[PDB]
């Protein structure tokens, strides 16, 4: 019946040199409050931290960041200007005190972009289990990818029959570049989902991947041919097969 | 990180074996420890603390702190390939600082029972000229490589559980679009075991 922890944007594109405020409120009564950055090499580093209304200090890496503490529900990070080193996945966390267990919210994609057109919607396409395989070891394995996406705000899901499954599926954990020579490339995610061979013949069995992207918002500006990538789910789907 | 230091890993552990975990901090000022876990893409959750020194047993999980000795590590007995994720230490220093490590990403490897490595070509469910290669059921001391040409994609291996059929297989995939591609150029003689069956698509 409480919230908890929320971290408002979930996803943001931020043009270079712009001013951004993540927000982040708990309705936990929580009176600490802390703010961390997730980076692949680095793990969390701890920008501002709050111990109590009205008092906040410095953590590992405040600078180009600011906080307030005008209240015990919210703890605001602002980004003065954004530069692209602020790409980075951000971690709001509270504590009933200092020094209890911290409660972590589900985390803000920021990617700071020089140039808004470099993004780009992912294609999804599913291939069909190999008869090789079905053969070799009565088993059915699907893949599904992902491709040609920036920045890599994506969420990779299998539906079997309108249903979620997480049985049977791997997705890879980082996206690949699908030009590593280039800073700004655009990436791809593949995903696999195997099931029974049997499960995989039945021409009821309906099997979707679909792929969440986080783009551009209703309020961004948009003057290319192409469409404007916002925020957007897109799909590819298969059905079972006896032959 | 830099008063709380971690060993970023990967650490591979074999499933059942006792995979082992440390930390260590500045002496000024720590008062409580913690060990988070953080599964790919999602949150770090508290698994355990501890603030005085010994061992503290919960389960599977046993965490030992000694503050004269300035660690404090998270064994995790039994292993499963479901522990496979971020092990974040994480330290409380007077004056506000909740402080973390690097964090090690752990990850235990399935005991393959019928190793049958094989790369199989699967196509497109859409009217198109696309393919991609599955290089599957190796065994879990297989490494994949990444790609040495920037038009081949390699993914890295990974795990899936088909829960109930008891079924764990590794697996990565690899596509090109290159005109004279195939799967073999991505899953050569660099990454597949000798006697991978690997059949012509039909
Ligand atoms: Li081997």
């Known amino acids: 019946m409480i919230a908890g922890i929320t971290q408002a944007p979930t996803s943001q594109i931020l043009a270079a040199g712009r001013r951004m405020t993540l927000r982040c409120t708990q309705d936990?009564?929580?009176?600490?409050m802390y703010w961390y950055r997730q980076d692949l090499g680095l793990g969390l580093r701890l920008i501002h931290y709050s111990n109590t209304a009205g008092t906040t200090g410095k953590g590992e890496v405040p600078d180009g960041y600011s906080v307030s503490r005008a209240n015990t529900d919210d703890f605001p990070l602002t980004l003065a200007s954004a530069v692209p080193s602020q790409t980075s996945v951000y971690f709001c966390?509270?504590?009933?005190?200092?020094?209890?267990?911290?409660?972590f919210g589900q985390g803000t994609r920021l990617t700071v972009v020089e140039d808004l057109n470099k993004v780009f919607p992912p294609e999804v396409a599913v291939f069909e289990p190999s008869e090789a395989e079905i053969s070799h070891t009565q088993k059915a394995t699907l893949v599904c990818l992902a491709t040609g996406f920036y920045p890599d705000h994506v969420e990779l899901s299998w539906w079997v029959n309108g249903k979620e499954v997480h049985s049977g599926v791997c997705t890879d954990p980082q996206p690949l570049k699908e030009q590593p020579a280039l800073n700004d490339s655009r990436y791809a995610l593949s995903s696999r989902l195997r099931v029974s061979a049997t499960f995989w013949q039945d021409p009821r069995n309906h099997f979707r991947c679909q792929v969440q992207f986080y783009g551009l918002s209703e309020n961004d500006e948009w003057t290319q041919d192409r469409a404007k990538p916002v925020t957007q789910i897109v799909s590819a789907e298969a059905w079972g097969r006896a032959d | 990180a830099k008063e709380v230091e971690q060993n970023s890993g990967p650490l591979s552990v074999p499933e059942g074996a006792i995979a082992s975990l440390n930390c260590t901090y500045s002496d000024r000022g720590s008062q409580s420890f913690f060990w988070y876990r953080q599964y790919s893409g999602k949150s770090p959750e508290l698994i355990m603390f501890?603030?005085?020194?010994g061992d503290k047993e919960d389960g599977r999980f046993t965490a030992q702190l000694n503050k004269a000795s300035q660690y404090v590590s998270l064994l995790i007995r039994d292993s499963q390939p479901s522990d496979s994720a971020t092990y974040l230490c994480?330290?409380?220093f007077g004056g506000g600082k909740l402080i973390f490590g690097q964090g090690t990403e752990l990850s235990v490897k399935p005991n393959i029972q019928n190793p049958d490595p094989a790369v199989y070509q699967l196509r497109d469910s859409k009217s198109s000229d696309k393919s991609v290669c599955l290089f599957t059921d190796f065994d879990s001391q297989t490494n994949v490589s990444q790609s040495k040409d920037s038009d081949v994609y390699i993914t890295d291996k990974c795990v899936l559980d088909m829960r109930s059929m008891d079924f764990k297989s590794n697996s990565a995939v690899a596509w090109s679009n290159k005109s004279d591609f195939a799967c073999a150029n991505a899953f050569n003689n660099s990454i597949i075991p000798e006697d991978t069956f690997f059949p012509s698509p039909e």
């Open positions: 966390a509270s504590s009933l005190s200092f020094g209890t267990e911290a409660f």
């Open positions: 936990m009564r929580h009176n600490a």
């Open positions: 501890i603030y005085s020194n």
């Open positions: 994480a330290v409380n």
